[PDB]
Design a protein around this ligand. Structure first.
Ligand SMILES: NCCCn1cc(C2=C(c3c[nH]c4ccccc34)C(=O)NC2=O)c2ccccc21
Length: 277
């Protein structure tokens, strides 16, 4: 058995957290328990009209398979005649992009801690044969205890039809049109650069100009960029996808976690550690 299927009437919906093209995330409090959930609401007619059923289905199926603290949890689903509802963890401290903008460049201790949690999360995800394909600060949420919770899985791939946010797109996605774990590792390199520098590495006036810089590996490190972090970024932002730290061709997550930038990191229990304030 499982809990009774929930329904709209079981909740007091509150504010809209955000709105997308095919869905809206609304904060809702379950009446019988007082628990707060971030409920993603999708209109069936619109999903069907735009051929998004594979994506919506993928979002639900991938999230159902995840069971790790660094990922948003899918607690339940239900639907009425017009909409689909996905009950998700409500990450109280919002997204990492907000935090980066709020504080600007992170010092080395904060960069290390959050980079380690993302690496640890990717190790888990890739270990299950799942690629995110749209990893960016906006999709990395912060829970009440300031640990990360990664979300946005509709565009994930379970091991060449989707391309994520321009600034985090890998060269292989612009040249060969194919999805690999290497693309998430490239995104990781961009994110580490962004935490240290305050902005992503490839920036320009429009998407075409950004893609142009990406394929030519046209970016540079600002002064004072932590040396070990720069070395790590240089080993992730590599045009040849098979040579990025973390790839099976480079012998996996072991060598990545062993990079000097992570020397003081205890990988086994990051989630029990107190995030640096
Ligand atoms: N602008 C946030 C975009 C990322 N995002 C946040 C969320 C989530 C949350 C949100 C938390 N704050 C938000 C602001 C805008 C939109 C969504 C949220 C949340 O608490 N839990 C989530 O999974 C989300 C869910 C599915 C797909 C993308 C999502």
């Amino acid at each position: 058995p499982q809990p009774r299927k929930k329904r709209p009437e079981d909740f007091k919906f509150g504010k809209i957290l955000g709105e997308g093209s095919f869905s809206t995330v609304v904060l809702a409090r379950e009446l019988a328990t007082s628990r707060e959930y971030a409920i993603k609401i999708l209109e069936k007619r619109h999903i069907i009209k735009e051929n998004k059923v594979p994506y919506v289905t993928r979002e639900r199926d991938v999230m159902s398979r995840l069971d790790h603290p660094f990922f948003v949890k899918l607690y339940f689903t239900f639907q009425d005649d017009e909409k689909l509802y996905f009950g998700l963890s409500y990450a109280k401290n919002g997204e990492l992009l907000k935090y980066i903008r709020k504080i600007g460049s992170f010092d080395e201790t904060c960069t290390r801690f959050y980079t380690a949690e993302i690496v640890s999360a990717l190790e888990y995800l890739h270990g299950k044969g799942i690629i995110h394909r749209d990893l960016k600060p906006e999709n990395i949420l912060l829970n009440e205890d300031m640990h990360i919770q990664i979300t946005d899985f509709g565009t994930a791939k379970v091991l060449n039809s989707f391309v994520g946010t321009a600034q985090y797109v890998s060269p292989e996605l612009l040249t060969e049109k194919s999805a690999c774990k290497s693309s998430d590792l490239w995104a990781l390199g961009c994110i580490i650069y962004q935490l240290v520098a305050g902005l992503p590495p490839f920036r320009a006036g429009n998407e075409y100009l950004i893609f142009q810089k990406i394929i030519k590996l046209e970016y540079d490190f600002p002064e004072k960029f932590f040396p070990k972090a720069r070395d790590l970024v240089e080993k992730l932002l590599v045009l040849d996808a098979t040579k990025r730290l973390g790839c099976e061709e480079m012998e996996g997550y072991g060598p990545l976690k062993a990079h000097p930038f992570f020397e003081s990191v205890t990988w086994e229990n990051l989630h029990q550690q107190t995030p640096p304030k």
